[PDB]
Nucleic acid binder design. Structure first.
Length: 188
DNA sequence: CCTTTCCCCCTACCCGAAGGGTGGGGG
């Protein structure tokens, strides 16, 4: 079925060995976290299907101790995606959170620290008028293959999942590093 | 391209003395 294919493609595109899976209750707004390996995520798909059908939104992000260069950019249009691709900020995957509403994961390197990923997230959110609240190194993204429960139920779709490092990836790390240490120099 | 999804392990209390049986909570 289409749910399992979407998850698999997404896990491949994100490339992480381990993930945090967030299950948010639509009534209380309470997030339930589960650290799973990629294989465990797929193993617990029937449960994730059940919780979703029982009115829970399903979210995904790399595990806390995972070495990665993934950065979430949330609340995008398809024109914003075209801008990203034309400016070297090609997403590793694009997720349709609700009809005609998108978000993207950008891979800047095979590995980058939280402090660099945090800076790049703030820059990427500003560059493409993305949601500034979603700009931090540990923000949850939607997991495709599940229904959107807040909207207003439509399926969350994985539009593309090439999983390649962004062209501006290495450059984004270089710039963030300089910006961080220049701000660190402004200590007095 | 784009479906209509549907779990299971851990543990307080139980009788009635020693550990296994059972319900409820919750990830």
């Amino acid at each position: 079925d289409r749910t399992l294919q979407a998850i698999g493609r997404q896990l491949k595109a994100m490339g992480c060995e381990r993930f945090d899976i967030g299950v948010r209750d639509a009534t209380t707004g309470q997030m339930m976290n589960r650290e799973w390996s990629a294989a465990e995520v797929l193993q617990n798909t029937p449960w994730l299907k059940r919780m979703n059908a029982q009115g829970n939104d399903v979210y995904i992000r790399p595990a806390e101790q995972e070495r990665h260069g993934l950065v979430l950019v949330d609340d995008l249009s398809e024109f914003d995606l075209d801008d990203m691709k034309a400016e070297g900020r090609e997403p590793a995957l694009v997720v349709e959170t609700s009809p005609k509403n998108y978000q993207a994961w950008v891979k800047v390197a095979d590995a980058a620290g939280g402090e660099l990923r945090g800076q790049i997230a703030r820059t990427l959110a500003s560059e493409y008028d993305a949601d500034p609240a979603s700009a931090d190194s540990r923000h949850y993204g939607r997991l495709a293959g599940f229904t959107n429960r807040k909207d207003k139920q439509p399926w969350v779709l994985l539009r593309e999942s090439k999983g390649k490092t962004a062209t501006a990836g290495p450059a984004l790390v270089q710039q963030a590093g300089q910006q961080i240490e220049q701000a660190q120099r402004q200590q007095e």
